[PDB]
């Protein structure tokens, strides 16, 4: 009945209708994107009309076309064909990630290529990666992607140890053909292999290592109905999926006593891009938006049980789309449970003589997907306290390249030969605030020092100051970790008992943001990335801080153009967009499979409850 | 057997034998801190030689005296009076917790005080607060602490609810004189209570919450020998515990194949300090130094299983010595256990069809200390891949004042009338170091961004610099987290498979560092906090940042003087000291009892291993 409820197989089956029928999915028509729209804005919208947004290809050379469909009514709302030179090409198809090796298997120069470096063709694995825009005219208009060839010496061996460097190749993969194969010179194909499930590699394995159980004797402590509406201790949200942005939360609230306030309405990673800082021609062009231009949630993995999520464990099999329109269920995407957090809150009073103990939890809802080489997990925490926060997990296998000799300043080794170019992992958070209700504003807050002096005598005191954010010219805030600061969410019209707007404190990692020169192609298509923080004011059509076509876009596009309409944003509906993310100088320990990397953010209330919301919480 | 074993109640007896018979002990003597002293560098001794550092007070007014004794030779090695006026007095005592308030009872002035706010004296408590050094001059030489009052309705109420504004009074607790009593007028004493465990103010207890049961069928995958020897998935190390201190980690090493590998040979937190940011003369002077005035380990949590410390834990139970020598021994005060930490590494490759994944572990050594309103966790955690990390949790009650009519620019509303100071709570961890043994040295890694242009076309390119600190002139160092600054720790004699020095990377949290004025007291006294990382040379007398007598002592000793020796610290026995703090705006969420906040820093191999360290851990 939830306007907010996960698509059904059913709802897929009935959009794939209405297109085919509507004689836009025949044979040379593929699906690069397909998911449901929210609600809008609005509860006169009595009875809900599921809309769903979808991105048609077409394998003949048509111009695309973006249309929305009602499956409430079974009708086409919109079709329009896309100009992709204008507005950016569609997402790449999984049904490409092989046609880039299959093209040039058939090309001279890329044979040329191979066997000057004596490379069997049959053993030349090549990655389907994103081409961005760069000094290629003929490229514009066109549906292009760039190979880098990784030698796979038998069908279980780890190509990521044997990068070809000196070689790359362009292709066109509606034309299916070659347009460019560059050669700048032979280097030597590391040799030592990389597969961490070889008992040479691996040595013998531990012994040492006892069981730990976590179980629940008596179920868990959440309660999910409407196949997708989740209540927590005092926590309340819907668990969204979408095949771009992977796991969405929607609705999330908190049940202060006698009502349920809301907190933030739909929280989400609006885009994620790996870019990266080698200077050779082979990889410079390599910026990859996993979110924007792969779509992470299409490659979600089945999380097994005991292995990717331990304990009492509800899952969730969102389904999605496959290129004909077809329903394709994610068995097991989303793992959701509640964990131990340590201690909550502590004091043994020297006076009462009372000691006091309380243990924490957290309600965590995951998911990790896979991108060629990269593994990224995707954790949303809520906690008995009140507070949110949000962590990826970057794992699998670093990209890998030749290791020059004569060393670089942009490159680490990890083994002989091996190299591994710098790059970084930078993810954006859009989060559209709810506060006690949708009129809401964002506040900078810095710590602010004080001069010893008339009132401070002693030079002990230290304050802070906190600015509004009025309006959008003036949202686009960089971090300060050194005068600590932080960005408060609050409701100007919503007070606490002690007279003051209730808020949420946002606490970033304050990690570097993209590094690229700010004239470079990458500063300008992922100009999200360059700023810690972003109000904008709610528009149902501004989604990704990237645009909605990020593939081979010019620039200029999301957050930029948005921030650019200047308007109000002091007590409106706002959304707050939070860059962050890790910058990589890979590790010899990150190779041959590197461990878990973490990093996140997370908000604290701020004067939001009248006093702790976790006073009723038992000794246990 | 092992030189590094915890101190046994024996030993604690014979120290009080010992300075007995060599007439230091005698009826008017208390000892103020004693704790057993590391094995001297090089096995310059042939056998072992177990010594202990105390420091014994006179309540009669006589000098106090630091001395040293050799508990296996039954030998007092060194025995100097003090004069405190120069070197700082000694640690606050127990016993002189309720002093301050019964002086204060039969006070004149201060009956006056109460007098005038309508306080019943039986129900005034007074807290026993550090003096710090300011213009007082009658204090120099003498052994003082300073009150601040609150009101306790009953026996088991919250005093801290109840702040008695515009009051302090200044107590010489050894000559039993109260020398100043200073009131600036009446302040409202909050009226509402603070007690969290009333079900008027919790409410009715929450019975959502199901039980999570962790348990270890096999037992845990740890083993402790020698009493306090801890081996744990190819982690080696020494669990010590210091009154002042409180746990302590010795000889840290990693089994690599089949060489045992040093990584830190010591790591403690040295020091803590709560300094205040209100102008106030009632609190201007407040500054808390738990670790060096009020020493963190004797007032050590005894920790209930299933509460505290979940799961199969294993408890140290430290002995240290009462005000007059006899051993007392710390039921249950140290936890030491292991758990899960989700998905250690994980790939599901697209060309080998191998899918892989692999969970984490972490082995947890922690301790819980209670000083008056505050109850500190310190947490050391060692990962299945070689990371170490350092955690603080900090909770109980925050200190409360009278909140100000018309506001205030330096404390938070709690509750109607009621205020919390705006104050930090900054750690110094010390780390002597040994990568690999002791040649270390230390280099700062800045990311270095790059311009656009000349073999930087795309301007894509970014890498980094790092910069060798040489001597301890050039050793002090500050944070700069837009730059992603880390500093290094490797051994330039000792180099990984390619030939490469091997080391270990500090990643801090770059939290604001001291606030206070540079010209302030606390500023001088706390030298350490004013800036990130400080790296001297190893050196057996240079234990604390803040020096050997933090109470009552200007500046003068600790890290700065150190540092003026500008001795070798490039390739040489160093160790680093690394500040990280909280900078606490009270909440309303944090009354009555506040949820736990963290803050801490971590350590993670830089090309210490010749790949990644985990490849032989098992499927489960
Ligand atoms: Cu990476
Ligand atoms: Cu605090």
Same sequence: chains 1, 2.
């Avoid at 008596?218 to 109905?225: A, D, I, K």
């Avoid at 989604?543 to 309409?565: C, E, K, M, W």
């Amino acid at each position: 009945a939830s306007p907010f409820r996960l698509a059904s197989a059913g709802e897929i089956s009935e959009v794939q209708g209405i297109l085919r029928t509507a004689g836009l999915l025949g044979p040379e028509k593929r699906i690069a994107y397909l998911g449901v729209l929210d609600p809008a804005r609005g509860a006169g919208s009595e009875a809900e009309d599921r809309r769903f947004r979808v991105f048609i290809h077409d394998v003949s050379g048509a111009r695309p076309q973006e249309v929305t469909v009602s499956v409430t009514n079974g009708t086409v709302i919109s079709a329009v064909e896309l100009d992709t030179a204008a507005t950016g090409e569609l997402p790449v198809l999984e049904e490409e990630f092989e046609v880039v090796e299959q093209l040039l298997a058939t090309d001279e120069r890329w044979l040329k290529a191979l066997a000057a470096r004596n490379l069997d063709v049959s053993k030349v694995r090549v990655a389907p990666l994103s081409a961005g825009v760069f000094e290629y005219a003929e490229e514009r208009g066109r549906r292009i992607l760039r190979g880098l060839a990784f030698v796979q010496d038998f069908p279980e061996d780890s190509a990521w140890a044997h990068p070809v460097d000196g070689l790359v190749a362009y292709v066109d993969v509606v034309s299916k053909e070659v347009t460019r194969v560059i050669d700048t010179g032979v280097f030597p194909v590391p040799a030592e292999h990389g597969n961490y499930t070889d008992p040479e590699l691996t040595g013998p394995l531990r012994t040492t290592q006892k069981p730990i159980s976590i179980t629940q004797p008596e179920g868990p402590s959440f309660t999910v109905t409407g196949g997708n509406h989740i209540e927590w201790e005092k926590w309340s949200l819907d668990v969204g999926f979408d095949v771009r942005e992977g796991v969405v939360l929607h609705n999330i609230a908190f049940r202060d006593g006698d009502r349920l306030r809301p907190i933030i309405n739909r929280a989400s990673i609006a885009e994620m891009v790996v870019p990266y800082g080698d200077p050779s021609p082979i990889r410079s062009w390599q910026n990859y938006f996993d979110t924007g231009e792969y779509l992470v949630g299409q490659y979600a993995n089945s999380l097994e049980l005991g292995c990717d999520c331990l304990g009492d464990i509800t899952y969730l099999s969102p389904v999605i789309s496959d290129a004909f329109g077809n329903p394709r269920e994610i068995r097991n995407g989303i793992c959701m449970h509640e964990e131990d957090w340590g201690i909550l809150a502590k004091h043994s009073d020297l006076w009462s003589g009372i000691n006091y103990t309380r243990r924490n939890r957290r309600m965590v809802i995951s998911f990790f997907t896979t991108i060629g080489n990269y593994d990224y997990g995707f954790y949303w925490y809520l906690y008995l306290d009140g507070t949110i926060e949000f962590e990826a997990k970057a794992t699998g296998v670093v990209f890998t390249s030749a290791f020059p000799e004569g060393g670089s300043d942009n490159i680490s080794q990890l083994a002989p030969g091996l190299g591994a170019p710098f790059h970084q992992h930078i993810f954006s958070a859009r989060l559209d605030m709810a506060i006690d209700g949708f009129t809401n504003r964002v506040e900078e807050e810095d710590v602010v020092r004080q001069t010893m002096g008339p009132g401070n005598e002693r030079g002990n005191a230290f304050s802070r100051k906190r600015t509004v954010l009025t309006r959008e010219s003036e949202a686009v805030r960089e971090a300060d970790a050194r005068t600590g600061r932080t960005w408060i969410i609050s409701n100007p019209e919503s007070k606490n008992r002690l007279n003051e707007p209730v808020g949420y404190k946002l606490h970033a990692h304050n990690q570097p943001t993209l590094l690229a020169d700010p004239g470079s192609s990458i500063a300008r298509r992922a100009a999200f990335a360059t700023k810690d923080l972003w109000v904008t004011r709610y528009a149902d059509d501004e989604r990704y801080p990237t645009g909605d076509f990020v593939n081979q876009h010019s620039g200029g596009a999301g957050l930029p153009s948005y921030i650019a309409q200047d308007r109000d944003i002091d007590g409106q509906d706002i959304v707050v967009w939070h860059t962050f993310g890790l910058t990589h100088f890979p590790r010899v320990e990150d190779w041959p499979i590197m461990p878990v990397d973490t990093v996140g953010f997370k908000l604290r209330p701020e004067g939001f409850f009248d006093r702790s919301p976790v006073l009723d919480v038992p000794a246990n």
